[PDB]
Amino acid sequence: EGVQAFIWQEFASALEVIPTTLAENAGLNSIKVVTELRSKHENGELND
Amino acid sequence: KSSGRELLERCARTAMSSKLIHNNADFFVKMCVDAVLSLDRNDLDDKLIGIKKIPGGAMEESLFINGVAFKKTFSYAGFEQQPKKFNNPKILSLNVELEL
Amino acid sequence: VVYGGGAAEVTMSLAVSEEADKQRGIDQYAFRGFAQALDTIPMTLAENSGLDPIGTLSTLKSKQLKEKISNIGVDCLGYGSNDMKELFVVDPFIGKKQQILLATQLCRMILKIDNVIISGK
Amino acid sequence: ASALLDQALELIQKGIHPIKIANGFDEAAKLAISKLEETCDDISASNDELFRDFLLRAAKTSLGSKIVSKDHDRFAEMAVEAVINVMDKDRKDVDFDLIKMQGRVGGSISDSKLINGVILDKDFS
Amino acid sequence: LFEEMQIGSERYNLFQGCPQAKTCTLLLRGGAEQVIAEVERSLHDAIMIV
Amino acid sequence: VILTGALLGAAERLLNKGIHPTIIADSFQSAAKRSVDILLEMCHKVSL
Ligand SMILES: Nc1ncnc2c1ncn2[C@@H]1O[C@H](COP(=O)(O)OP(=O)(O)O)[C@@H](O)[C@H]1O
Numbered sequence: 001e002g003v004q005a006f007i008w009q010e011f012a013s014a015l016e017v018i019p020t021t022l023a024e025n026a027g028l029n030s031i032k033v034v035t036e037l038r039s040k041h042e043n044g045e046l047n048d
Numbered sequence: 049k050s051s052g053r054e055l056l057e058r059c060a061r062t063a064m065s066s067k068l069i070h071n072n073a074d075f076f077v078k079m080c081v082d083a084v085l086s087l088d089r090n091d092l093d094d095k096l097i098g099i100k101k102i103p104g105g106a107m108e109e110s111l112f113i114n115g116v117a118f119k120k121t122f123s124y125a126g127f128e129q130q131p132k133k134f135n136n137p138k139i140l141s142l143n144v145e146l147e148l
Numbered sequence: 149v150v151y152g153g154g155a156a157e158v159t160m161s162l163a164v165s166e167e168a169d170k171q172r173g174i175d176q177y178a179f180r181g182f183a184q185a186l187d188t189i190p191m192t193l194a195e196n197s198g199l200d201p202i203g204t205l206s207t208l209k210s211k212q213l214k215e216k217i218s219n220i221g222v223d224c225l226g227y228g229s230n231d232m233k234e235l236f237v238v239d240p241f242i243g244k245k246q247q248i249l250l251a252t253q254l255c256r257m258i259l260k261i262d263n264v265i266i267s268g269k
Numbered sequence: 270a271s272a273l274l275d276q277a278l279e280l281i282q283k284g285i286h287p288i289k290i291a292n293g294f295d296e297a298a299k300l301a302i303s304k305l306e307e308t309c310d311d312i313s314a315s316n317d318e319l320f321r322d323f324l325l326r327a328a329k330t331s332l333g334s335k336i337v338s339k340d341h342d343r344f345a346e347m348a349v350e351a352v353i354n355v356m357d358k359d360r361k362d363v364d365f366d367l368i369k370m371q372g373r374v375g376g377s378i379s380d381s382k383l384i385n386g387v388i389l390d391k392d393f394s
Numbered sequence: 395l396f397e398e399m400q401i402g403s404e405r406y407n408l409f410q411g412c413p414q415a416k417t418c419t420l421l422l423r424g425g426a427e428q429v430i431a432e433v434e435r436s437l438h439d440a441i442m443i444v
Numbered sequence: 445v446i447l448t449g450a451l452l453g454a455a456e457r458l459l460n461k462g463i464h465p466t467i468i469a470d471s472f473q474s475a476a477k478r479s480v481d482i483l484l485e486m487c488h489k490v491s492l
């Protein structure tokens with residue numbers, strides 16, 4: 001908790017630019033992909 | 049044997065797509081449907097639906113009235129002394145020019 | 149009448165955030181953009197008044213979520229109390245409403261433009 | 270309006286179409302304005318004495334964000350006393366066209382005093 | 395009924411309560427000047443359907 | 445390059461937030477160092 005919490009939060013948001021572009025270039029709906037991945041990850045899947 | 053009022057609302061909903069109105073179509077579709085129904089079915093005219101390009105205000109603040117407005121005109125000294133609200137006034141029209 | 153000065157904006161903001169949570173899909177992210185867009189006004193008042201936007205924005209979001217009283221905003225003159233009942237500030241409802249209506253109705257027109265042709269004079 | 274555009278520009282990058290974003294903002298705007306109407310307080314039930322004071326609370330707000338705020342108590346009475354003379358005290362209308370406004374370049378701003386009449390810029394015959 | 399109200403820095407005289415009137419009017423507002431003209435021609439197309 | 449543009453877009457709004465750039469810059473260095481600590485954990489070894 002502190003002033004650097006928002007900086008680390010935006011650091012995590014900007015790091016997901018790669019898979020957002022793969023869904024954009026492939027014609028897929030990106031947000032879907034990013035959120036799905038984020039979750040399939042909550043079930044213990046390290047690689048998705 | 050459906051109702052006639054709902055027919056105009058149903059077909060006008062398609063026209064309000066691909067515009068800035070499609071979310072505010074619930075309120076403005078009633079305006080044009082009630083506006084065209086006031087016209088005569090035999091003689092439907094395109095010049096009686098004039099819309100004035102008045103600035104200011106949000107589009108949802110508009111109001112539909114069966115009457116007609118005109119925009120105040122030149123107004124020689126005399127204006128802002130008469131009552132600006134009447135109960136049952138009588139409207140007169142004159143190609144008459146009343147000047148000395 | 150209403151009570152502006154970030155108060156209105158902060159209120160509106162938490163409202164939108166809760167509703168945003170009750171919304172799932174492309175829509176939620178939007179609602180979130182509308183929430184963060186309303187926060188720029190009290191952050192601008194905090195920026196011009198010199199106060200910290202972190203402590204100011206965090207205090208309004210945390211306090212307004214706890215208490216239901218919705219007349220606390222950004223104190224720019226440097227008073228010790230942020231409650232606007234004592235500071236003598238009042239705004240109209242028709243004035244604060246038109247900021248959102250004319251803004252959200254214009255930006256629909258700004259976003260629809262794809263082809264932009266400018267004839268040089 | 271620029272804040273909605275700045276937050277919308279990133280949404281498009283994330284992948285969203287512009288029109289969805291617009292629809293969304295609009296819905297959100299409705300929610301917000303509404304919710305504001307729910308928590309809105311009305312001051313019409315009070316009498317004219319307390320309602321007289323509420324005009325100063327709002328007149329001082331808009332005059333506070335200008336250079337006129339050196340004496341906000343003094344010049345706010347000018348903006349309130351002018352409307353007392355035009356209000357009908359029941360189903361009130363402002364009648365804005367009657368209220369004229371003219372300023373002369375001269376003296377200081379502290380010497381400004383409200384009058385009831387018409388200001389002429391011409392001499393006698 | 396008849397009432398004049400400054401709809402936006404413009405004074406306009408409005409007739410009201412005319413059920414026998416075979417005409418109509420529309421006072422469309424807008425943030426900008428093209429929002430008015432765009433919504434003007436939009437409802438003109440909507441009127442053209444009905 | 446695209447991650448650099450994403451972090452600059454993340455740093456664009458943080459400049460308006462009112463946080464010093466050096467605090468924002470040092471935060472990415474600590475976050476990048478912790479990102480390497482995450483990469484070494486999930487690093488799957490391979491044989492020659
Ligand atoms: N003394 C004050 N205390 C708290 N808030 C204030 C004070 N003065 C102004 N504000 C807020 O700052 C805002 C400034 O608006 P203003 O700049 O006067 O209008 P505009 O932006 O159209 O010029 C107001 O909406 C009000 O909520």
Ligand SMILES: [Mg+2]
Nearest residue numbers: 330331332334
């Ligand atoms: Mg102002």
